[PDB]
Design a protein around this ligand. Sequence first.
Ligand code: MH0
Ligand SMILES: CCCCc1ccc(C(=O)O)cc1
Ligand SMILES: [Cl-]
Length: 393
Amino acid sequence: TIPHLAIDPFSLDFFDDPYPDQQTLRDAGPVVYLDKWNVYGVARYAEVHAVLNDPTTFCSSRGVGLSDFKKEKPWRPPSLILEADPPAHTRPRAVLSKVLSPATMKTIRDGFAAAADAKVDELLQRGCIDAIADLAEAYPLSVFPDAMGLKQEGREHLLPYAGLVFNAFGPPNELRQTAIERSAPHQAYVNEQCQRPNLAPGGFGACIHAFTDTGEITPDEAPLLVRSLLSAGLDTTVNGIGAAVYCLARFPGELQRLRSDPTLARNAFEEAVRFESPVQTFFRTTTREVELGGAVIGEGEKVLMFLGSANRDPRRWSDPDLYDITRKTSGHVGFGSGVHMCVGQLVARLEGEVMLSALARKVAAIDIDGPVKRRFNNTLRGLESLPVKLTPA
Ligand code: MH0
Ligand SMILES: CCCCc1ccc(C(=O)O)cc1
Ligand SMILES: [Cl-]
């Protein structure tokens, strides 16, 4: 009654061109079974959205990766927010919400925007750049580690530690095993910067530690909460900004509309998050037998959500394969949905907005002038190299 497919969604063939296989998964039915890894899969918008908004049935405490924490030891201590269900999740989420709050964005907006404008000026003087290393990576590295309050030395561990966290959500393929086999130096760096003494005052990390007085989190919880932001806060925005530049390179008609109204910068980024979905997939675990779209799913089973596929489901979106910077993007699941919805989305949207704003005002054309290279990750989608030529406005 549930179709069985042999598609491996964690194979290099799938990462290269996931959209044909994603249509196959959507059209096979609301719920499929993935024989390769012995998990259920949901790829339409309706079921992906329903799983995300039923945290009691589809829990996160047994892991949001393939590994089931009731069966295998986690490779690192589980996240206190990402891999926690209510009520345990509520207090750490509230703290992170207040740290990354609307009121907090007012404190950083001018600095984030100025660094965005400075970087575009620096790239325009170079002309032929790599939009990944020189922009998608360079810009967030110049604002987020400082916003975190991190020291200057050692920041080369941040992106490797991030790509390790997102590879480790996947199955035990070579991508995951090769990452974990090199983890120790990055884990040691990250775990040290989470201690209150090593975080500059006024930064995100210090603010989390200051929330131990309220009774929302204890002092021993604060280091793992800083770890969350160092795990989720950098590589996702890199891939998001990378995707936006990619989209503007592939759809010059949208760059022209953006140039003619730079207030579209925020929705241009949001649409790139829908269109590319930097976070492609992750898992939930069923706490009971549950009927999902006419198919019953036993207790203790892993359910794989295709977030990128749900952001391109024609049953929910009009012309989903088109990059449209004036689309009503509200309702996309690129930031998740429900109680776990990305608590750092204001930081991501801010970085994306001010960077697309800088490009909208300073750049007249973005032309790909070199081999594009994809970066392969079990959970992240994005580019390794994007050779582009920037033409000043
Ligand atoms: C500064 C911090 C920060 C930034 C920036 C950030 C940027 C991004 N993120 Fe995202 N992310 C951050 C910190 C988190 C946390 C701590 C959590 C876990 C929240 C919870 O309650 O479990 C999270 N993000 C949760 C999520 C989830 C939902 C996970 C789940 O349901 O299990 C998604 C899909 C996500 N993110 C995507 C993205 C994308 C896409 C971007 C950027 C374009
Ligand atoms: C399922 C991946 C969502 C992004 C993410 C990664 C890590 C954390 C964390 O370390 O808590 C949170 C969210
Ligand atoms: Cl770690």
